[model samples]
Target: SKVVYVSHDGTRRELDVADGVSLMQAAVSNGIYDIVGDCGGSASCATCHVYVNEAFTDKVPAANEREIGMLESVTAELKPNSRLCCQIIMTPELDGIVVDVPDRQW
Candidate 1:
């Protein structure tokens, strides 16, 4: 499956991600800007915040209780599409998934 990471400037970078790989890992390994992954996907750090494209929102699972709580501290604006990248794992059903990096990730 692939994930298209969009930047705040509106540029897109598509990465081929394997199943079981969390979006935060893929982003950090691929050097996707703004995805700091400061806590290494522990869900404690809000630095991996991203906005899942609305069309593919249903593909990923709902955020867990801890993820939901951590979201409250994101340095970016939280919207209905907001998600913590580390909480979103890649799957075949999510091929071509698109996520947008916010203006800041703190």
Candidate 2:
């Protein structure tokens, strides 16, 4: 799986992830600092919040109730594209996905 992370300063990081791994795991394991995934991808913490790029937003399913609830508490301002990276599993359809990282993950 291949994904791109866009940082606040316009830096972009292209990452290759293993199949079936959540975006949080792929990023954290690769030392991508934008996502902390404080709840270890349980969807209990919104610290891994990211904004799905417009080009690929519709490619992902809508967030479930639980995830939405968690997202409401994220340190980052929620946007129409907001998503918890921990809830996104890498798949072939998402190979070129891009997510914009907030200035910080808290």
Candidate 3:
């Protein structure tokens, strides 16, 4: 399966990614520059923040409390669609999901 990452300015990159791996892990491993996963997908850092496409938001499960806390600390504007890529593991259902990267990560 593949994931489509759309940058802030509309640059899109599609990567052949695998299931059972966090979106952050897949992005980092595949050199997707926007995802830092600074805390190694531990949900301690918000560097992997991304906006799940509205059409697929319901497909992703709700965020746990820990992840919600971390997401609150993200520098970007946290929206209802915001998610920490680290918390989202790839699945057959998530193939071709589109996520938008913010302008910055820090």
Among all candidates shown, the one with the greatest lDDT: 1
Q: In model 2, what lDDT does residue 12 have?
A: 91
Tens-digit lDDT track of model 3 for 1-90? 789999889999898778888889988888788888999998899999999999888888889999999998989889899999999988
Deviation from native of the Cα of residue 5 in model 2, angstroms: 0.8
Give the Cα-based TM-score of candidate 1 against the true structure: 0.97
How high is the CA lDDT of each candidate model?
0.93, 0.89, 0.90
Off by over 4 Å in 2: none
| Candidate 2 lDDT trough over 10 residues, lowest sum | 54-63
- Candidate 1 lDDT score relative to the true structure: 0.93
- Descending-lDDT candidate ranking: 1, 3, 2
Question: Model 1: per-residue lDDT, tens digit, 14-104?
Answer: 9999999999999999989689999999898899999999999987899999999999998879998999999999999999999999999
| TM-score of every prediction relative to native | 0.97, 0.95, 0.95
What is the clash tally of candidate 3? 0
lDDT of 3 at 59: 89
